[PDB]
């Protein structure tokens, strides 16, 4: 039984398999991946600053400790200081958790986690450590600074968020949702993207708030060749409030990033890779999203490479408002073999899009023939590793120029196997079917989710002067029969319009497309499923979604009435929609397992999937796209937050079921990633044990050049902004 805000000692750890994909790379391709990976791991440290006030200190303390003494050496000291093997293991798991999440908050769930041992016992280990003997001042200093917050589980520190009842470093501690809304209106008016920005509010002597929008860049207040960002660097007046646009956020870190990006540029395969890197450098040096947009523009044209990569402030999941981006970056080898079926899905994607429950007027003008490859991840820096990605997030690029889809093949392989004894909330007659097809089912789901899901739908946009990207005279809204009366104006994006629900809303739309189009035989045939096996995959895919809808209650916060994980909230909604259809399709039954503790069961009538589930899902999917395309945020919130409402209403009683979900929950696996070392000319791949100590070791050897320098940098950046929280 897992404990909230605590990583269990027996937490699953899997090492990313990357030996074969790396063994195929040419010397130049290896050197290319080597420097790109270093750029990713460098910038990945910025996530610490984007997580919690104490996260940079904790990483600095852990890095110091394990540099002087590896887990086996530190074991001998810790056990001599009174720590049991269990208590020491708890510290190893915590450290590995901080490393893999780049912070003391889970990327998947946004909950704080603390070390599972006495604080006074860990103190003796740290103060008596070898790192403390070599540098007593900075070790005692770090422990004094982050020690309290390392263990504290005060209610306002338990979850990420704005307001006084949450923690965030995207904003200063005194910021609220009202502040975030005012900032977004200012940002939209200046056509300034929020992706690489943070917001800080300081009050003057009077008490009047002053707002600072700090951009992420190497350069600061000093003049430079750029004018696009330079001209923006000034004070503003917005609705009575004074705004100031600055830059230089994570400056020494991004400095390390552009160094490795520039070195990787000398090993680029083509001009597409060469120009996109130069633009990323421009973006990270100047603070220009446009420069990153220009880079992404070249990146999309780099069709089916050998080493695929992407880097920057990409996703906006962990921003409580939902517009600011968390830094990430990945380097992967395109698995030509597994990428065959995905290109096959693209080849018939244009016709598949027509099967979607909305008129072509709400679909993109032209099918853009996007790249879709199966990837073997070498490096995925940041807070967490996804199963698949649809990028870039710039919708003006995806609806006009193009986009890319990637399925992380060596990531799917981790959760491919299934243990029957650890299955939860499933009927016994379904367990064998679930095990046999769970793997293959999400492989199809990932493909549809990214390509047919994220890659579908048009946004109605009106430019600054009249002209609509659609024809308002002919286009009619299906749900009302009237002409379009709502759209996106200039400067408005998906994230700016729907804000706090933008992520989850879209994932719900994407997940729904996946389920809906998994009924189509030609889709399953592409992934190699026909006849009896085909309907089995369908049944399991729907069984999984309904099951996941129940598991999702783990990621809901009752006292705040707030969902913490977008994809999980999305699956709970779909569960609710299928429950709403009735007809005995889906039922949730509170039971009592052999454990003796409260349990639950989920039943899904296979025969009523196409007759009841599909039309209900088709109705729901139509509503989603309509409100999305028109930017009807009021209707969107009315529709989505309705199904996303968690209550103890009969017969389900979700609030009571939530307690059962938490009681039988299983922690998500930590993933150990390999390292690449350069022996002057040749590049080698270092692998590690699939354990906490193995994950720790992977970071100890991750920065052999300037490790202690990064600790100092992260410490400096943290102290500089300490007054904010």
């Amino acid at each position: 039984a897992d404990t909230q805000y605590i990583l269990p000692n027996d937490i699953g750890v899997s090492s990313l398999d990357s030996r074969e994909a790396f063994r195929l790379l040419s010397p130049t391709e290896r050197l290319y991946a080597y420097h790109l990976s270093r750029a990713a791991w460098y910038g990945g440290l910025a996530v610490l600053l984007q997580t919690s006030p104490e996260a940079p200190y904790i990483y600095a303390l852990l890095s110091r400790l394990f540099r002087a003494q590896d887990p086996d050496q530190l074991r001998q000291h810790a056990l001599a200081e009174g720590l049991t093997e269990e208590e020491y293991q708890a510290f190893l798991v915590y450290a590995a958790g901080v490393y893999s999440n780049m912070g003391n908050y889970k990327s998947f769930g946004d909950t704080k986690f603390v070390p599972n041992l006495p604080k006074e016992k860990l103190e003796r280990v740290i103060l008596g450590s070898e790192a403390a003997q070599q540098h007593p001042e900075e070790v005692r200093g770090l422990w004094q600074t982050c020690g309290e917050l390392m263990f504290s589980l005060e209610p306002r520190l338990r979850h990420l968020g704005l307001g006084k009842e949450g923690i965030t470093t995207y904003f200063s501690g005194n910021c609220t949702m009202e502040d975030a809304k005012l900032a977004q209106d200012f940002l939209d008016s200046q056509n300034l993207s929020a992706y690489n920005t943070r917001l800080f509010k300081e009050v003057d002597g009077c008490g009047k708030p002053y707002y600072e929008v700090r951009l992420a860049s190497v350069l600061g207040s000093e003049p430079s060749l750029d004018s696009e960002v330079t001209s923006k660097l000034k004070s503003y007046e917005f609705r009575g409030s004074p705004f100031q646009v600055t830059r230089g956020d994570y400056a020494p870190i991004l400095q390390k990033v552009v160094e490795q990006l520039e070195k990787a540029k000398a090993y680029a395969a083509n001009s597409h890779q060469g120009q996109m890197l130069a633009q990323y450098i421009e973006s990270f040096t100047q603070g220009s999203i446009e420069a990153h947009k220009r880079g992404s523009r070249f990146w999309i044209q780099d069709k089916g490479p050998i080493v695929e990569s992407y880097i920057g402030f990409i996703e906006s999941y962990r921003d409580p408002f939902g517009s600011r981006g968390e830094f990430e970056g990945f380097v992967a080898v395109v698995n030509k073999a597994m990428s065959a079926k995905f290109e096959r899905l693209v080849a018939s994607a244009e016709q598949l899009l027509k099967e979607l429950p909305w008129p072509p007027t709400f679909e993109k003008d032209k099918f853009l023939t996007p790249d879709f490859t199966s990837l073997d991840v070498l490096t995925f820096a940041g807070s967490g590793i996804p199963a698949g990605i649809n990028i870039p997030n710039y919708d003006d690029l995806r609806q006009t120029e193009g986009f890319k889809n990637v399925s992380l093949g060596n990531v799917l392989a981790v959760a491919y196997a299934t243990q029957r004894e650890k299955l939860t909330f499933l009927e016994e007659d379904d367990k064998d079917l679930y095990i046999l097809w769970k793997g293959p089912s999400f492989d199809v789901q990932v493909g549809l989710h990214a390509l047919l899901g994220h890659g579908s739908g048009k946004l109605f946009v009106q430019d600054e002067k009249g002209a609509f990207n659609f024809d308002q005279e002919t286009v009619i809204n299906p749900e009302t029969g009237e002409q379009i009366q709502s759209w996106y104006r200039c400067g408005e994006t998906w994230d700016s319009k729907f804000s706090t629900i933008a992520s989850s809303y879209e994932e719900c739309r994407a997940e729904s497309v996946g389920l809906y189009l998994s009924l189509h035989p030609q889709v399953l045939e592409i992934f190699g499923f026909e006849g009896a096996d085909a309907e089995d995959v369908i049944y399991v895919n729907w069984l999984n979604m309904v099951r996941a809808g129940l598991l999702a209650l783990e990621f809901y916060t009752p006292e705040a009435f707030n969902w913490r994980q977008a994809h999980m909230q999305a699956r709970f909604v779909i569960l609710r929609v299928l429950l709403e259809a009735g007809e005995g399709l889906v039922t949730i039954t509170p039971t009592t397992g052999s454990d003796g503790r409260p349990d639950a069961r989920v039943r899904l009538d296979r025969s009523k999937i196409r007759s009841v589930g599909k039309p209900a899902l088709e109705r729901f999917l139509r509503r989603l796209q309509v409100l999305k395309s028109t930017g009807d945020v009021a209707g969107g919130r009315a529709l989505y937050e309705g199904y996303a409402t968690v209550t103890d209403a009969p017969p389900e009683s979700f609030l009571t079921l939530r307690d059962t979900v938490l009681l039988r929950k299983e922690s998500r696996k930590l993933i150990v990633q390999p390292n690449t070392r350069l022996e002057g000319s040749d590049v080698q791949l270092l692998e590690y044990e699939a354990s906490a100590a193995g994950l720790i070791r992977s970071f100890s050897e991750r920065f052999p050049e300037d490790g202690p320098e990064l600790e100092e940098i992260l410490t400096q950046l943290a102290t500089a902004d300490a007054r904010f929280w």
């Binding site: 999941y317 996804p386 990605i389 990932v446 990214a450 999980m568 299983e666 998500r668």
Partner: peptide, 8 residues
């Protein structure tokens, strides 16, 4: 936009 697998 990202795609996730749960449980993982």
């Amino acid at each position: 936009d990202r795609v996730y697998i749960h449980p993982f």
